Amino acid sequence: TLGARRGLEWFLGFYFLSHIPITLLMDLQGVLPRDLYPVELRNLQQWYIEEFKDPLLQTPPAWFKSFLFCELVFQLPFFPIAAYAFFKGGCKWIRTPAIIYSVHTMTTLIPILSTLLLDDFSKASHFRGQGPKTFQERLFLISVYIPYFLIPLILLLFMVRNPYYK
Amino acid sequence: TLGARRGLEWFLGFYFLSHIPITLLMDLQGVLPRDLYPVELRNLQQWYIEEFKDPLLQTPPAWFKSFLFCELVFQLPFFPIAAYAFFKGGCKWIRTPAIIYSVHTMTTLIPILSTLLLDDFSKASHFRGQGPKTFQERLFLISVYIPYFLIPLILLLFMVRNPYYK
Numbered sequence: 356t357l358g359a360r361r362g363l364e365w366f367l368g369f370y371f372l373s374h375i376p377i378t379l380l381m382d383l384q385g386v387l388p389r390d391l392y393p394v395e396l397r398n399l400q401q402w403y404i405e406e407f408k409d410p411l412l413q414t415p416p417a418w419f420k421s422f423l424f425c426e427l428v429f430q431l432p433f434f435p436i437a438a439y440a441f442f443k444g445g446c447k448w449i450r451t452p453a454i455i456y457s458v459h460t461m462t463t464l465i466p467i468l469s470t471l472l473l474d475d476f477s478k479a480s481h482f483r484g485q486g487p488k489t490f491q492e493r494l495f496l497i498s499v500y501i502p503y504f505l506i507p508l509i510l511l512l513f514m515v516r517n518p519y520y521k
Numbered sequence: 522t523l524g525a526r527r528g529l530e531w532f533l534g535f536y537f538l539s540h541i542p543i544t545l546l547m548d549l550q551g552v553l554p555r556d557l558y559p560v561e562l563r564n565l566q567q568w569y570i571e572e573f574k575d576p577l578l579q580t581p582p583a584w585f586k587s588f589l590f591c592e593l594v595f596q597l598p599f600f601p602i603a604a605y606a607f608f609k610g611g612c613k614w615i616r617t618p619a620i621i622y623s624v625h626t627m628t629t630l631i632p633i634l635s636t637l638l639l640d641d642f643s644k645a646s647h648f649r650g651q652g653p654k655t656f657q658e659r660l661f662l663i664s665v666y667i668p669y670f671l672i673p674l675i676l677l678l679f680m681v682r683n684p685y686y687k
């Protein structure tokens with residue numbers, strides 16, 4: 356019926372397929388001009404920031420804004436290519452690019468997860484009137500970012516050791 | 522003669538070999554306790570911080586702190602292995618590990634160079650007056666950080682298309 360490799364390849368395909376509208380309509384809002392987005396999407400973003408108390412996409416710091424520029428220039432063009440390769444199967448040429456994407460995305464989230472878990476978001480910090488204050492709110496926000504470190508990690512382990520992609 | 526390929530392997534070897542003392546004696550002073558270093562080395566880092574106006578090494582922010590731990594846990598054990606492989610040459614088993622190191626090293630410096638070049642280090646910022654203000658001071662600091670982005674960039678492109686490592 357279905358194999359364990361092929362089933363993961365379908366999971367990787369939808370992960371890249373869903374990342375295209377998620378990046379365009381949500382994450383790149385902190386870098387791209389606001390007038391590119393309708394009023395409905397701009398308030399949709401504020402719903403997420405107010406519900407999850409996200410302080411990075413709200414006012415992007417210089418280090419976090421540099422990562423968003425990487426997501427537009429390097430990751431976003433790679434998402435449709437990776438979605439096709441893992442949906443069709445047998446595309447061995449995606450091996451090295453997928454490894455490059457996985458290590459790059461895993462490295463971007465390490466400072467993000469570390470910032471949300473340990474930093475203070477009250478006054479006397481650059482973030483003002485924003486950020487999680489309790490341990491529950493910090494974990495509630497980390498769970499939203501944590502798939503973009505685990506799934507690239509799974510892809511990295513999958514691409515390195517799979518004899519079919521080597 | 523020698524050959525640009527072999528010479529690059531010789532250049533890569535000295536890059537990883539010299540990276541061990543640089544990481545152990547200078548870079549990790551922000552995450553390791555100050556007591557571990559003698560007084561001369563502590564003040565030698567004080568010389569670099571005061572002359573170069575380095576705003577990230579003395580009081581490392583959380584995002585920069587997580588990268589220093591990645592330099593200690595992941596990069597430093599890899600430096601002797603890669604130095605031996607490139608001094609000897611023709612080690613096919615270094616291709617995938619070197620690609621992972623390169624992308625990881627390029628990704629950690631994009632926010633670093635961006636902060637040094639564009640961020641605000643005035644006395645009213647959370648950097649508390651420590652940091653470059655003029656364009657020449659920013660480039661003096663970028664000049665010492667930039668080799669660790671270009672050399673991994675050369676390594677990444679080298680491993681991807683070199684047949685002797687496939």
Ligand SMILES: CN1C(=O)CCc2cc(CNC(C)(C)[C@@H](O)c3ccccc3)ccc21
Pocket residue numbers: 377381382422423425426460463464499500503
């Ligand atoms: C800069 N960057 C990257 O370079 C790697 C991918 C990434 C990922 C993210 C996380 N994106 C959120 C949490 C917004 C996403 O999960 C979401 C979207 C809609 C509803 C709920 C959650 C934020 C930034 C980046």
Ligand SMILES: CN1C(=O)CCc2cc(CNC(C)(C)[C@@H](O)c3ccccc3)ccc21
Pocket residue numbers: 543547548569588589591592596626629665666669
């Ligand atoms: C976290 N990380 C990495 O993951 C890659 C290597 C790296 C490199 C650096 C930059 N290290 C300095 C600027 C300190 C070094 O060039 C130096 C040493 C002695 C005298 C002058 C300059 C800072 C952070 C990282």
